[PDB]
Amino acid sequence: HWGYGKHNGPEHWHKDFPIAKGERQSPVDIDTHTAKYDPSLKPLSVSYDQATSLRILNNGHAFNVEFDDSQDKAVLKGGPLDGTYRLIQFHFHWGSLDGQGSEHTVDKKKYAAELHLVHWNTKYGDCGKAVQQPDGLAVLGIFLKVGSAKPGLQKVVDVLDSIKTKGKSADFTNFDPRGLLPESLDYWTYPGSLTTPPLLESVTWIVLKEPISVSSEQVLKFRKLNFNGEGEPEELMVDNWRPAQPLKNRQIKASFK
Ligand SMILES: NS(=O)(=O)c1ccc(NC(=O)CN2C(=O)C=CC2=O)cc1
Numbered sequence: 001h002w003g004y005g006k007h008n009g010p011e012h013w014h015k016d017f018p019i020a021k022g023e024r025q026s027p028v029d030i031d032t033h034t035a036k037y038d039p040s041l042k043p044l045s046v047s048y049d050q051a052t053s054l055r056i057l058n059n060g061h062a063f064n065v066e067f068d069d070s071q072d073k074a075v076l077k078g079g080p081l082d083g084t085y086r087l088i089q090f091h092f093h094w095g096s097l098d099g100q101g102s103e104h105t106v107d108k109k110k111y112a113a114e115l116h117l118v119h120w121n122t123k124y125g126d127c128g129k130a131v132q133q134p135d136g137l138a139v140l141g142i143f144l145k146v147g148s149a150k151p152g153l154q155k156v157v158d159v160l161d162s163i164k165t166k167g168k169s170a171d172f173t174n175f176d177p178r179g180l181l182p183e184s185l186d187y188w189t190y191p192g193s194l195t196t197p198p199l200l201e202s203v204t205w206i207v208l209k210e211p212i213s214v215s216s217e218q219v220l221k222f223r224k225l226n227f228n229g230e231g232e233p234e235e236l237m238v239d240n241w242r243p244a245q246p247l248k249n250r251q252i253k254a255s256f257k
């Protein structure tokens with residue numbers, strides 16, 4: 001099955017998922033000089049006050065912090081979005097070294113990691129239906145750089161020892177995702193796709209300009225996770241990022257001057 005290795009990695013995905021070579025694939029390089037300020041963008045609204053986390057899962061590709069999305073609570077609205085998008089999960093992509101790990105790049109700069117907060121358009125009723133629509137999902141992308149520790153990340157870091165291997169999960173209630181946001185909500189936006197198979201072209205990407213800082217010790221604990229299951233040979237969960245894909249007929253818009 002698909003993964004991030006030499007024999008099952010991003011360069012192989014097109015054989016089982018031909019949309020890998022499509023017209024709106026993600027991630028992309030964000031050319032900051034070409035991106036144009038868009039005055040038609042409305043104010044972005046991230047309303048996570050009532051977010052209700054449930055569980056954390058190692059799925060063999062990353063780990064997901066899952067939310068109860070059965071009521072209208074943690075919502076993303078405004079910016080490029082029409083209507084309301086509900087938070088369902090977040091996860092990260094990261095590197096084996098501090099010099100790589102992000103999926104999006106900024107003037108070809110790779111960050112140490114990238115946080116994806118995944119939301120579905122409530123007009124489609126649930127996330128499984130939403131992902132089949134061109135405006136079905138909105139992913140808020142946040143870059144991570146190595147420096148000062150992120151206090152709001154530490155509860156995630158400390159539970160990772162309990163979900164080391166593929167298929168392990170743990171209770172993860174009362175986690176506040178507001179502790180993972182930077183100060184500024186300045187962003188770039190473009191139409192794209194899931195960055196993992198099935199690579200569906202159903203995502204509005206909103207990538208924040210300001211990275212968050214995490215400590216070397218925090219990211220080192222991400223790198224102790226395993227792609228493999230319990231009782232299988234250890235394959236460290238590192239470099240679980242897809243490289244930048246062709247921009248093709250797309251414009252990246254900036255929320256800021
Ligand atoms: N990397 S990314 O583009 O943000 C990316 C984002 C999302 C998914 N897939 C899912 O969320 C699958 N899923 C559901 O539909 C409901 C729960 C769940 O885990 C895959 C990739």
Ligand SMILES: [Zn+2]
Nearest residue numbers: 091093116195
């Ligand atoms: Zn992702």
